[PDB]
Design a protein around this nucleic acid. Structure first.
Ligand SMILES: [Mg+2]
Ligand SMILES: [Mg+2]
Ligand SMILES: [Mg+2]
Ligand SMILES: [Mg+2]
Ligand SMILES: [Mg+2]
Ligand SMILES: [Mg+2]
Ligand SMILES: [Mg+2]
Ligand SMILES: [Mg+2]
Ligand SMILES: [Mg+2]
Ligand SMILES: [Mg+2]
Ligand SMILES: [Mg+2]
Ligand SMILES: [Mg+2]
Ligand SMILES: [Mg+2]
Ligand SMILES: [Mg+2]
Ligand SMILES: [Mg+2]
Ligand SMILES: [Mg+2]
Ligand SMILES: [Mg+2]
Ligand SMILES: [Mg+2]
Ligand SMILES: [Mg+2]
Ligand SMILES: [Mg+2]
Ligand SMILES: [Mg+2]
Ligand SMILES: [Mg+2]
Ligand SMILES: [Mg+2]
Ligand SMILES: [Mg+2]
Ligand SMILES: [Mg+2]
Ligand SMILES: [Mg+2]
Ligand SMILES: [Mg+2]
Ligand SMILES: [Mg+2]
Ligand SMILES: [Mg+2]
Ligand SMILES: [Mg+2]
Ligand SMILES: [Mg+2]
Ligand SMILES: [Mg+2]
Ligand SMILES: [Mg+2]
Ligand SMILES: [Mg+2]
Ligand SMILES: [Mg+2]
Ligand SMILES: [Mg+2]
Ligand SMILES: [Mg+2]
Ligand SMILES: [Mg+2]
Ligand SMILES: [Mg+2]
Ligand SMILES: [Mg+2]
Ligand SMILES: [Mg+2]
Ligand SMILES: [Mg+2]
Ligand SMILES: [Mg+2]
Ligand SMILES: [Mg+2]
Ligand SMILES: [Mg+2]
Ligand SMILES: [Mg+2]
Ligand SMILES: [Mg+2]
Ligand SMILES: [Mg+2]
Ligand SMILES: [Mg+2]
Ligand SMILES: [Mg+2]
Ligand SMILES: [Mg+2]
Ligand SMILES: [Mg+2]
Ligand SMILES: [Mg+2]
Ligand SMILES: [Mg+2]
Ligand SMILES: [Mg+2]
Ligand SMILES: [Mg+2]
Ligand SMILES: [Mg+2]
Ligand SMILES: [Mg+2]
Ligand SMILES: [Mg+2]
Ligand SMILES: [Mg+2]
Ligand SMILES: [Mg+2]
Ligand SMILES: [Mg+2]
Ligand SMILES: [Mg+2]
Ligand SMILES: [Mg+2]
Ligand SMILES: [Mg+2]
Length: 97
RNA sequence: GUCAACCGAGCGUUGAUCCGAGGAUGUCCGAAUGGGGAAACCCGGCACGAGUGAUGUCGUGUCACCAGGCGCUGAAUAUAUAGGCGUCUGGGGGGAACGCGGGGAAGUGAAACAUCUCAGUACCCGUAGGAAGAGAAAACAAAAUGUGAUUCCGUGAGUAGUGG
RNA sequence: UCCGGCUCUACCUGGCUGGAGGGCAGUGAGAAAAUGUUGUGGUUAGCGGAAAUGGCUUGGGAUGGCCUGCCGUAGACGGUGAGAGCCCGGUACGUGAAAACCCGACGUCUGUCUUGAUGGUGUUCCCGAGUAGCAGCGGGCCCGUGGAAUCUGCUGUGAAUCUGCCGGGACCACCCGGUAAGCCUGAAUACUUCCCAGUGACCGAUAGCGGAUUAGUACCGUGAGGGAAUGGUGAAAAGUACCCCGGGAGGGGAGUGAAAGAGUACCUGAAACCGUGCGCUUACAAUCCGUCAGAGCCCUCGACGUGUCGUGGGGUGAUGGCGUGCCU
RNA sequence: UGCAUCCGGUGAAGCCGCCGAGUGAUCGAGUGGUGGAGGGUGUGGGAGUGAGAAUGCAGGCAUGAGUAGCGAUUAGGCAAGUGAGAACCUUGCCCGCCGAAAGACCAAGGGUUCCUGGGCCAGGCCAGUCCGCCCAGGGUGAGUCGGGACCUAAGGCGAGGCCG
């Protein structure tokens, strides 16, 4: 779905614009992803209970994958004649990911 | 799956969940169809297996009504029939409207009111279908040596007519 | 074309049925049952599907404002922190089904018939009966007995079969035109509980279906039946750690957040309504509660000094003139 | 709705004020404070288009007013305990009342109102530690009692049948 677990994504819209991070969990039922080190929020818990800062999810539409050349890019798909596997495309240059 | 989260356990690179096709599973009531009954609950007959010292006990199946046939039987009785069985195939109930068909009213208008109107409308009932119904003139027409099944549109026309 | 057997037997002429071969067509309303299958046809679900991190500004957050460049056979649509074709779902376009199912042909196999068919000169028991029509009684055709055809039918009656019938709007003659009492047969048409895709000068929570929410629920009625009210925190739960008052509820701080006069009784929060405070009025006053005058006090503003003028204001209103709400 | 297309997060609509202007219904590229997402000049077009009345409808809030009433004829006082608070609850002492009930069992009926534990917003016509409140847990043990295995009345259903 152009955004998977463990990828490298760059935030487009949001207070923590321009940061980088990994993908921890995807909420495809809600299309809302969670990225460590981005969109840092605070929380209050009363069980041991303190001001625990936790990571909140973002809409995937506000994030995108960054190519190895440090250039964020859309995603494209191919069908591998060798095995028929649908792979990623660095849309600007169409490499493999 | 959701409320709803949450955990807790956990599942996946061999491809788990997710979607689609076919299949199996489907307790009980419910046309209910083994009998009965206050629905979701009581009570049996028959055939095969199993366990107990045996019974007790267990599972599985089958067991309505009507219609139409088939085989067997046959009461008054003599022939034969009714009835009696047993077996195959159908139907049984539900569903918004539409269609057909059997039946079918008053409020109302008439400035009252019966004829009349309201109207063969509402409603009830029995049918099928995806449509139905109607359908190949015993029809019209009017001297033309004309039309040529049914059905549905717009006309013809609120005209000919009908009506205390 | 041929073969056989018949019209109670065997031998010319005449009238039928059965078998070898061109038909009639067939899942058919006019013969019945069987014999089996190919469209990138569609349906059931799917795949790809272009082109800005572009930069700066306000900005919480940009899709926004400005500047460039973008692609488009795709600038319908939805979402993302505010108006997004160049961010995602996706849009044109392309593509695709192992299996099953609805609509389209094609070689096993089946029936029939060519004992039947087409064209030419004269004399002698069949083709819809309790039916057509009739007397009475009623019904449907615009037609209510009216002068009343045609149709149907309840009861009694009841016909001809070709020089037969029935219709031609009472009814009759010549002629004029079409076969009743048996049967079936697609297309044009009506409808939508159900599904899909699209659209609306249709509503936007007292509207709109009764029902955007546990709704045909709560509830009412024993019954048939009736039948409600009740949407929005935030972009995201980040739903108020911790401290203090109090038993808690409730509340005040602290933090979250752009905002907590967004705190879950949660957008906006009006009016009736009930308060606090402030300025002024009111305890000799007879009444649709105002209007016209109108001093005083309060505050406001400019020319001008301590308050007086000035084409002065707003609030109050002491007192007096007039004054009998509104709709029917 | 149509439009040249614009207005606006440098604050739209909406709300509450103020100012000025039109003879009116109003208007203001007119603004101050809340609000934080849409409005729309002009010219047409179409309307569920303008509310005070209808003993209108639905919702909210008024007043009579902190007034009437707090639901019997049996009736209490007090000690101590719990608790923040104690007439109203727990324990104790006395008093009173029913005692063919105002006691004890069932049927019909209701269905967790039974017991234990916790808390008192909401409910109890007041407070309430209490409750028939709410929250959690527990609780119903039958060959011999009762309803089916049995039979039947009134009556209901009813194969065939009769009539419609
Ligand atoms: Mg399947
Ligand atoms: Mg299937
Ligand atoms: Mg099974
Ligand atoms: Mg039964
Ligand atoms: Mg049965
Ligand atoms: Mg038979
Ligand atoms: Mg006999
Ligand atoms: Mg049937
Ligand atoms: Mg009348
Ligand atoms: Mg009249
Ligand atoms: Mg009438
Ligand atoms: Mg009529
Ligand atoms: Mg059919
Ligand atoms: Mg037909
Ligand atoms: Mg006409
Ligand atoms: Mg795709
Ligand atoms: Mg900026
Ligand atoms: Mg832009
Ligand atoms: Mg612009
Ligand atoms: Mg668009
Ligand atoms: Mg948009
Ligand atoms: Mg997007
Ligand atoms: Mg008449
Ligand atoms: Mg006549
Ligand atoms: Mg004829
Ligand atoms: Mg016929
Ligand atoms: Mg048709
Ligand atoms: Mg509203
Ligand atoms: Mg009831
Ligand atoms: Mg802050
Ligand atoms: Mg409120
Ligand atoms: Mg609000
Ligand atoms: Mg005063
Ligand atoms: Mg005085
Ligand atoms: Mg006087
Ligand atoms: Mg007065
Ligand atoms: Mg006066
Ligand atoms: Mg006076
Ligand atoms: Mg703003
Ligand atoms: Mg503002
Ligand atoms: Mg403004
Ligand atoms: Mg706002
Ligand atoms: Mg607007
Ligand atoms: Mg216009
Ligand atoms: Mg206009
Ligand atoms: Mg109106
Ligand atoms: Mg009003
Ligand atoms: Mg009025
Ligand atoms: Mg009124
Ligand atoms: Mg009152
Ligand atoms: Mg009093
Ligand atoms: Mg009193
Ligand atoms: Mg009482
Ligand atoms: Mg006490
Ligand atoms: Mg006594
Ligand atoms: Mg007694
Ligand atoms: Mg006694
Ligand atoms: Mg009882
Ligand atoms: Mg009971
Ligand atoms: Mg108790
Ligand atoms: Mg307790
Ligand atoms: Mg309490
Ligand atoms: Mg109460
Ligand atoms: Mg409880
Ligand atoms: Mg019977």
């Amino acid at each position: 779905m152009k955004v998977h677990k463990g990828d490298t994504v760059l935030v487009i819209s949001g207070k923590d614009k321009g940061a980088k991070g990994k993908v921890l969990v995807a909420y495809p039922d809600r299309n809302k992803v969670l990225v460590e080190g981005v969109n840092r929020i605070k929380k209050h818990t009363a069980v041991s209970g303190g001001i625990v800062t936790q990571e909140a999810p973002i809409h995937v539409s506000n994030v995108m994958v960054v190519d190895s050349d440090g250039k964020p890019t859309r995603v494209g798909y191919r069908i591998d004649d060798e095995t028929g596997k649908k792979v990623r495309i660095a849309k600007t240059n169409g490499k493999d990911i």
